[model samples]
Target: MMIVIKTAIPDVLILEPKVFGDERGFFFESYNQQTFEELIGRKVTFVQDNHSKSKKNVLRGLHFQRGENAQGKLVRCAVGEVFDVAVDIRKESPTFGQWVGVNLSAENKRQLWIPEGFAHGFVTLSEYAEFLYKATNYYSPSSEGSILWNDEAIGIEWPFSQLPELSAKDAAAPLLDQALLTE
Candidate 1:
């Protein structure tokens, strides 16, 4: 797979692998620990594989886990399409407060790497979308937190004409200025 590095948020990346196609089907390596470590500049141990399905207009995140529960994620869309986003929240990082986004789907099979210092979110772009991720940490609901999806200061251009559907928690998530963080 080819790793496409984003300059906007250097900590975030999109890995697009070369898929070999034949009359039968296609094949590609979705993950390589060695390559991932080289690209990310650190070794990450992912402990859990998680999946979620979202109908059109289902908006989730700007989500993060605080303190020792912070997670690094490799996310992809397996069924449909989505505009996936990640924001750098590490106060000490050069890219702090900046964000980057990419379109991922079954058609592309690309993976997005969101490092531990970022918040993650996505907007559904198909009739339905199935998302999968390998997380460095198992989810802890009580430790999960989020920033407002539409925080004007961040200016994330969510595709929905109307506000996308969000859980009460996401709808109530604070703005970046108000978000709680370790750094």
Candidate 2:
């Protein structure tokens, strides 16, 4: 059975797949329908799979899509290491504006589940890293939004030895108080 650990935020979770390894190699089921449904206590249909590669100190996101396009994500690092985070953005939830971060790496085989109503992002800690995830819904550009990665209200403790590399969109993202929410 896979290990499902709850995070500080209400619905966010850490999923650790059972890995079998010998001197030769290692293997684990990255995605399993039956196992996942039982772990989360519900069924979620994944509509999309995404992949990306990033260099050390490259940060991407604090992003989410809302309303009909909201996505629940299962994220993992497949190549190197990263610091991953999910921020609660549901204004009415008790944990609104709270966040949790985790260290994930290919060696650890740790994965994170960020349900809908959360903003997700990560920073590469290794020389290079490959990131992959399954999304519960298809992406809609018009429905996408982001919060400032270092917003004072959220105060995300992003690990970086040097200045982080950011996209123009992320560099100019709105703060939590000023960001748009779907509901």
Candidate 3:
């Protein structure tokens, strides 16, 4: 995979696979352990794989698991496009409250590495989008925390001209100041 690093506060590490073309279509290995380890600088055991689908304007995060259940994620778009993002929230870290965002789509075949100690989320940009991801920890509902998408303190210019299509859970997420954090 080709590693493209970002300079944003929470840093974005993009891993793009080398695609082999053909008359029919194209082929590539999305995740190669050796390449992944070399690019990210840390070897993590991803314990779970997750998939979800959403229509344009749909938003699904600014969420993370806190405490010992913290999780890191490898987020990708299987179909359509999305603006994926991560926010630094480790209270004692220099980057606390800062964030980074990137666009991932099927044609680009890119993945975003969101390390632990941050909140993660994305908004679909196409008519409909399908997302695939791997998490480094088992999801714990009780430990899952959220930061309001429009929080004033960490004003994220979340990419969407229209208001997001939201779920009750997403609409109810609290602000970073009100959410739980790891000590």
Best model number under TM-score? 2
Model 1 residue 76 CA deviation (Å) reads: 0.7
Q: Give lDDT per model, in order.
A: 0.87, 0.90, 0.85
lDDT of 3 at 6: 62
- Sort by lDDT, top down from the best: 2, 1, 3
lDDT of candidate 1 at residue 177, scale 0 to 100:
82
lDDT of 1 by residue, 26-128 (tens): 8777887897887777778899999999999999999999878999999998899999999888877877788888899999887899989899999999999
Error (Å) of candidate 3 at residue 143 is: 0.7
Better of 1 and 3 by TM-score: 1
TM-scores vs. true structure, each candidate: 0.93, 0.95, 0.93
The model with the greater lDDT, 1 or 2, is: 2
TM-score, candidate number 1? 0.93
Where does the lowest 10-residue lDDT sum fall in candidate 3?
3-12
lDDT of 1: 0.87
Model 2 is weakest, by summed lDDT over 10 consecutive residues, at 174-183
- List residue ranges in candidate 2 displaced over 4 A: none
Candidate 3 lDDT over 1-183, as tens digits, reads: 365666566345777765767888987777777877777787878899999999999999999888788998998999999998888888987988888788899988888988888899999999999999998999999887888888887788887778898889989988888885345
